[PDB]
Scaffold this active site. Structure first.
Site, PDB file in Angstrom:
ATOM      1  CG  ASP A  35       1.942   3.789  -0.573  1.00 25.77           C
ATOM      2  OD1 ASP A  35       1.372   4.207   0.388  1.00 25.77           O
ATOM      3  OD2 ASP A  35       1.968   4.420  -1.587  1.00 25.77           O
ATOM      4  CG  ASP A 223      -0.373   6.816   2.911  1.00 25.58           C
ATOM      5  OD1 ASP A 223       0.212   5.824   2.586  1.00 25.58           O
ATOM      6  OD2 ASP A 223      -0.677   7.672   2.132  1.00 25.58           O
TER       7      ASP A 223
END
Ligand SMILES: COCCCC[C@@](O)(c1ccccc1-c1ccccc1)[C@@H]1CCCN(C(=O)[C@H]2C[C@@H](N)[C@@H](O)C2)C1
Ligand SMILES: *[C@@H]1O[C@H](CO)[C@@H](O[C@@H]2O[C@H](CO)[C@@H](O)[C@H](O)[C@H]2NC(C)=O)[C@H](O)[C@H]1NC(C)=O
EC number: 3.4.23.15
Length: 337
Positions: A35, A223
């Site tokens: 992430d 992201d």
């Protein structure tokens, strides 16, 4: 150094991408999301009560089975748009690819059923900056850089369309480089607004010819943690109206037959138009005029300081191979393949 290691990723439904890490000696493996929108590492803890079903259903780190484990025990709390996780800090060695790093991570003792009952993964490894790490824990990539072993202080992400094939490779991440087997051409690089967040400026968002959104600029977070592309509730509502899309409790939908003729969506970044066709953005299960189809875009209002922002998730990354550049504070895009 010369090291450029790789980690294979698993693609579940085009909504979860994850890979393996090992913690401890001997190594305990976990499945983790990589992430870019977070900076901390956590996995579930043998200390998690089975009162949390997520800790039942997921793999648990046992400190006591490891020789490299070092106690810290300082409390950690992590907040995501969705779940909040809790625990303490531990130190142990973590392997990614061929790289072994001594790392500080959270051992989680409270994991809610929503959402981790829905996770095909164990934990997350945040690839963000220290600026955003909770507790000011040094993030895993910085520690690797410290090791001085990568060829270039960058990492890259390839995400694939889900396939029926056993052989098909769901994703890959590269430490210290990019793999050109998976992109065509040369990277186009966009500078970060500032260090500490993998976020860049966006000129506009187009539905078709007309420039409908973010028409006077906006923010774009890149992201890898995120499934869908996201925008502000206001941005999204309008974009959704433009597509004739309809709103349902969890998702946005169109009639499965009308998806292919929907307009392209372009994101204007770094002076270039980055375009997704409806083939990139509808999950076309059928083409029945009788069935409804999910779009991979949703609203998420991300609060300040990071928000408001668009987030460019896997829906985007599937088209564009993405290089995250720590040394030069730039993000690179190339056409995936
Ligand atoms: C491409 O791989 C995607 C992995 C799944 C991500 C996710 O779909 C998910 C699904 C099921 C269970 C848990 C989680 C999940 C939940 C929290 C953290 C990590 C994964 C997330 C759903 C909630 C909104 N969204 C994010 O905000 C994201 C924002 C991003 N920065 C992350 O922190 C979470 C993504
Ligand atoms: C666990 O990590 C914490 C936080 O980094 C450590 O606390 C710091 O320790 C240093 C060095 O001894 C102190 O000078 C700092 O002031 C401490 N920081 C804070 C915020 O208190 C802690 O020592 C580590 N614990 C163990 C058991 O190793």
């Amino acid at each position: 150094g010369n090291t450029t290691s790789s980690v294979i990723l698993t693609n579940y439904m085009d909504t979860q991408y994850y890979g393996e890490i090992g913690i401890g000696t001997p190594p305990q493996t976990f499945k983790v999301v990589f992430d870019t929108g977070s900076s901390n590492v956590w996995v579930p803890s043998s200390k998690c009560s089975r009162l949390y079903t997520a800790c039942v259903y997921h793999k648990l780190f046992d400190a006591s089975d490891s020789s490299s484990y070092k106690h810290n025990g300082t409390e950690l709390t992590l907040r995501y748009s969705t779940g909040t996780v809790s625990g303490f800090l531990s130190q142990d060695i973590i392997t990614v690819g061929g790289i072994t790093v001594t790392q500080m991570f959270g051992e989680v003792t409270e994991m809610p059923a929503l959402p981790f009952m829905l996770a095909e993964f164990d934990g997350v490894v945040g690839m963000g900056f220290i600026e955003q790490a909770i507790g000011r824990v040094t993030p895993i990539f910085d520690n690797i850089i410290s090791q001085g072993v990568l060829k270039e202080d960058v990492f890259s992400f390839y995400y694939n369309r889900d396939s029926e094939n056993s052989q098909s490779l769901g994703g890959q991440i590269v430490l210290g480089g990019s793999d050109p087997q998976h992109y065509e051409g040369n990277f186009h690089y966009i500078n970060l607004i500032k260090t500490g967040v993998w976020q860049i400026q966006m000129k506009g968002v187009s539905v078709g010819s007309s420039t409908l959104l973010c028409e006077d600029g906006c923010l774009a977070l890149v992201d890898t943690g995120a499934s869908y592309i996201s925008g502000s509730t206001s941005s999204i509502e309008k974009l959704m109206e433009a597509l004739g899309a309809k709103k349902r409790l969890f998702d946005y939908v169109v009639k499965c037959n009308e998806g292919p003729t929907l307009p392209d969506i372009s994101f204007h970044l770094g002076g270039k138009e980055y375009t997704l066709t409806s083939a990139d953005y509808v999950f076309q299960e059928s083409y029945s005029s009788k069935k409804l189809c999910t779009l991979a875009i949703h609203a998420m209002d991300i609060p300040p300081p990071t928000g408001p922002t668009w987030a460019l998730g896997a829906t985007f990354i599937r088209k564009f191979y993405t290089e995250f550049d720590r040394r030069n504070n730039r993000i690179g895009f190339a056409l995936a393949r």
